[PDB]
Amino acid sequence: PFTYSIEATRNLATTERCIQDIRNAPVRNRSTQFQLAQQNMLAYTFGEVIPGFASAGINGMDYRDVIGRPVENAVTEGTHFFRDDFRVDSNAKAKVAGDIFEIVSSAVMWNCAARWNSLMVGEGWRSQPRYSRPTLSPSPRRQVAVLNLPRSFDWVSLLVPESQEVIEEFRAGLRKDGLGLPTSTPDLAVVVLPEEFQNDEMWREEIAGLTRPNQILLSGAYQRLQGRVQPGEISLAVAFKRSLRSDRLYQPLYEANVMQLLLEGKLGAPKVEFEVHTLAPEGTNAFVTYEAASLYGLAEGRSAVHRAIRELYVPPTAADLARRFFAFLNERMELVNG
Amino acid sequence: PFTYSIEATRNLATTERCIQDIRNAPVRNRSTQFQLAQQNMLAYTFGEVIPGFASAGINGMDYRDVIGRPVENAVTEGTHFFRDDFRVDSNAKAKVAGDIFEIVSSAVMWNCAARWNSLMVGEGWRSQPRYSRPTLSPSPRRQVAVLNLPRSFDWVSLLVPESQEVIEEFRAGLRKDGLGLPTSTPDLAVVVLPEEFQNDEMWREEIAGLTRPNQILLSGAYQRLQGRVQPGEISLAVAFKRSLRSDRLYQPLYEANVMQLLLEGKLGAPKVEFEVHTLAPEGTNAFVTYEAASLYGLAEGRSAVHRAIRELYVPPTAADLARRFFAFLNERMELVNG
Amino acid sequence: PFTYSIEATRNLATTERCIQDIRNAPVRNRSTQFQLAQQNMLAYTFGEVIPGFASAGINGMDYRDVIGRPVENAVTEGTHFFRDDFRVDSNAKAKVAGDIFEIVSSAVMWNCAARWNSLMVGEGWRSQPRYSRPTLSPSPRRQVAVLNLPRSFDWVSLLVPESQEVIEEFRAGLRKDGLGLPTSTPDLAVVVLPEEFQNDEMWREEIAGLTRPNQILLSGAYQRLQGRVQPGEISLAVAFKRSLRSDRLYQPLYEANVMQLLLEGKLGAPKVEFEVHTLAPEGTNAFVTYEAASLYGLAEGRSAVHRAIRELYVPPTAADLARRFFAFLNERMELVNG
Amino acid sequence: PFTYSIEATRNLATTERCIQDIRNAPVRNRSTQFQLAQQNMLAYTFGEVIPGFASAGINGMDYRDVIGRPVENAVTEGTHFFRDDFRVDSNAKAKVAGDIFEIVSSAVMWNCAARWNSLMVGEGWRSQPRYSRPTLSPSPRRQVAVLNLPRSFDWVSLLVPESQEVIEEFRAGLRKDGLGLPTSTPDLAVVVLPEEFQNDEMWREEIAGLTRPNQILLSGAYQRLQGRVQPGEISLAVAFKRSLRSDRLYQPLYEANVMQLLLEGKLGAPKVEFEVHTLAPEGTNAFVTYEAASLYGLAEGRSAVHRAIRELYVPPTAADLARRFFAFLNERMELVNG
DNA sequence: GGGTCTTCACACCGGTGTGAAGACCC
DNA sequence: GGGTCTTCACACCGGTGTGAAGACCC
DNA sequence: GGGTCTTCACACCGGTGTGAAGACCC
DNA sequence: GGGTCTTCACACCGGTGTGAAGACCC
DNA sequence: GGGTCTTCACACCGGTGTGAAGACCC
Ligand SMILES: [Mg+2]
Ligand SMILES: [Mg+2]
């Protein structure tokens, strides 16, 4: 349920409850009395609804109210069973709500993917929400595969092994001096679908919830493309940060300045689009600070300089995320052999 | 006082109290009931004592107990006047304690500077704490000037204007495309003293406290060297971070990869030492992650590759900070015309 | 509860509260305003959990944090009802915390006993915590009975009355000159189970808490073996001292040098293992000082000399106490008729 | 001064003040804000007066008021300079007051020694306090040397090296098995004066204070008899404990049961008198518990059994300590060749 | 490179909670 | 007049000052 | 029998369902 | 109309949930 | 002895104090 029905939380199980009492089980470093089950809170509120693509009153809501609703949905569960004992620290209400923004917004553009994949293969343009049809020539080798990425991923394992050896040579070349290229992985990698999946139906079946069946699918769809995509076909890379501070905006820059060195450079990609989706850009001069030239090209003169960040987006609603991702596919997929 | 005398807090003024009640004055975005006066808490505990160089029982204390003592010194003030009302948020107890680590540790190596400046000019080797004499030839053109840096500083204003024009050409060259080189400033910049100050006594008078007289001196000594030092004479750059997480260790990397591009490169410095001083490296694989090659040299083949971080230091005491900074000056100042 | 739930202390009774206000009832010698209920604090924190054998995050915690947690659990109760009045003297926070160490650590090896008794009688090797199975031949006349001992106990009343008369003859022989053999009793006496209890189920039912039902069982299980065990079958004697000073380590020596005279000697035991379990051995040269030969054998030449203390143990966790007591039973119970 | 003159504490030096502020000098384990100078507090109150032998109104005072007066003399100093900051922990008010009882009571029987030494050599019987003359034949080889002993002393170094080799053989014999004979030293060892000092005037000059001149004399007079006294001439051994608890009375038993084994036994002393001087025997059954037979003789049958403690004394005044020590010398020195 | 100084073990009692034997009428 | 209740010894560690051996350059 | 006390009108916004005009592609 | 004062970006760590590699006997 | 389970690094934002540039009349 989306609006905290009082009996479905009493019809649920203790395993699938929103908050597990770990007051009789510390974990040796943090004295966490109560924890917020991230995988259960997503299955509770967004379990039978998806923002952007369902129940258009939700799709016009403020996107700072869709994200951050499972956190207040968990507090109203916590003040029901654990009366007067309930405390969740504010540093725990930001980790989960940041990860809610990481998963849910990736699940909205998954629904934009499967509707884009429908129009490419000759199927119609689902019009249950009023979304405008893209004006591109429908070709089956244009469907896109959006992929959520894990915490310790390194993203080189998606490239074809004829191209993966150059990066491994560049990495093991740095290992001779005792060095390396450590990076943080971006929260979202948008790549085009390879040849082996041009008739598979798992890239067109639109998702209708965020239950744990269709939740390990989205965290685990990356493994089916592990070593398939050419380096010139990684279209978009989306870093997800819920709010920005005047120093936390630099950790996506080091995500891009490695991504614009191992692709532009050793594997010869032209330019990979890297962009940041935020909700609270206030308190920072972040739009000016994201006008940063990439440090990769600053050594070989002024041959080709460009931005390290494509755009800094502030989605006002959930449906405005889906409208932007359609116009992104309407322009980037023009430049392939349709 | 260091150990919370009960009457000096009652002999103090309401202006110089450790905590001002701003409960009748909000600031329109944060509902801060009580604030921690950072400039007053440093003047209260460390007002007549300096770690490392005074009262050797303090100098052998755990350095996580020296830093973080003004925060608990303020709580014991807050539970005295404002009984039962007192709440300071944990996100406010980290900003001040991080800034306490930024100022106090810079004030310890200031005392290492003025004793190094004494042995260079022919004065003796003050031995009130048992610190070993450096085995270098005493030359007056070897004394070092340690400088705390502000929040919006850009550090190019320290270079001589014959060398400052190249960086301004490289910056305004990027401004033609609507770009830039934004950076965070390091918390400490260690440079050698220029020719105009080789007889001045403000670089040898050892500081004996952290009162507001000798506090705007340390935050403001950088302006006296604004446009004096050659680019090949910036010896050490110290970034101060009290604890590290698996993503907050990247914001000093972007501080270094710009510092190793505007000095190595456009102004031809050989290699500028950049190092991070932390207290809690646990919960991270940060020593392996700080074995990162600089992204500046990764474009022109493999001409000269090196680390972007020199060392990751964990000071066990306060006197072990002073012992390391003496051996750093014992090695780096060998390579000048003594 | 283990981590101070705010309403179970409000759901508790005034009788079973953690701190009774005796401010309207002095006791004629000590002006104790507030007292720490030792029997209630054990029932509050460890009431539904046992260290070593439950909730393995607890079992890996530092053992100086398990013991000493009911003392800080009582302070957080005391600053709730009795606001600003609350003072417990530090000499009262050591007596209870020392007695907490006396009872809880005896209750951990009781759980090691009942699992050892299960494998001896043919029942399985409970594996809810991952504890290694002992490699001994399972015989029913090998199960062990661990016994907590009171404050004024004299431990001779456990021996069979055919052997108790020799000690009473030696005691009443000394009473003719107006003398005696006064001793302090050890906090723990580990003896093997007699013939009358080889089918009883009270030595195999594992304890699941420290509530006052299963608390007078552990302080009172000694009376069921009052006059049953032969003198050659007292395997281990454990003295419990939370921290050691350079003179408080001698009061277990006089506990051993009487125990190694009334058993080795008048009742002909070979050697009784006597060992001290401590948490803070710092500030002492106690490991060298516990290499003391027993004063019993120093009169008849050098016939048989040995240590008065077997080992000085420092348990790092709670599960490491259970691992040591299993390997102790794996070696000492080899030397009986299995 | 004895009764806290307000200007002699202001005429004193900061070095010889009763309390040094170590608030700017921790000592890495204890957070001692203010310390009680033990060597200065004895020089302040008892600096020009000695109990028992001076100003007979003092000598009739309660002996729990003479001892424990420098502790309250220090508190009245501490609430004068350090207003409202002053806190000395009760665990620090017992260590010093116990050591005050250790030094002052040893200094009273030093005055009984030098008056006993005067009557032995033919000098008169000083009668400034009305003390009864002993009825013994005055012989010069009967004068006694009372010795305060340090903290890490082992008391074997007082015996003649022809007798010291047997104990060293017995100790190194135990070292072959990795053992030893660790002991606590008694606070006072009373031995008879050897042949080399039968005309020296340092054993007859009566002490007239406890200033630091005549304070290192009393802690350091033991070194002049280091290896001089035969084992059959150690008359009295006094252990000093201010109050007794039901387990702290055993640490003098282990002091005696080694002293009644290395002297009775290996060096053939008949019986060495060992006694405990206490002020608060309440709360214990200590008089019955000090009726303990020595564990040395309990192995060779019932050849010769005796007490390990001679007497447990409770001195009501200071002059009653001097009256007991005169009657002790009136009986023990009858049994030498007068 | 024997002096200065930072460390460490030494032995220091005191306010304690609880069980068992005392107190006292009925 | 065996019950209730007021007492008492039991064994409980923890913050300590000072001497002697450590630390370290010169 | 003017004080005490039980009553009453005053004016206080806030969460609402439905029709009609908006929104948007086709 | 240069002073006073109200604002804002700066850089500040800390308590976190989950996946994957560790731990350990059998 | 491959399973179960105890651990750990990963990447997660949010409430902050202070300096410098803004605001505004005079
Ligand atoms: Mg992120
Ligand atoms: Mg920093």
Ligand SMILES: [Mg+2]
């Ligand atoms: Mg004990």
Ligand SMILES: [Mg+2]
């Ligand atoms: Mg003593």
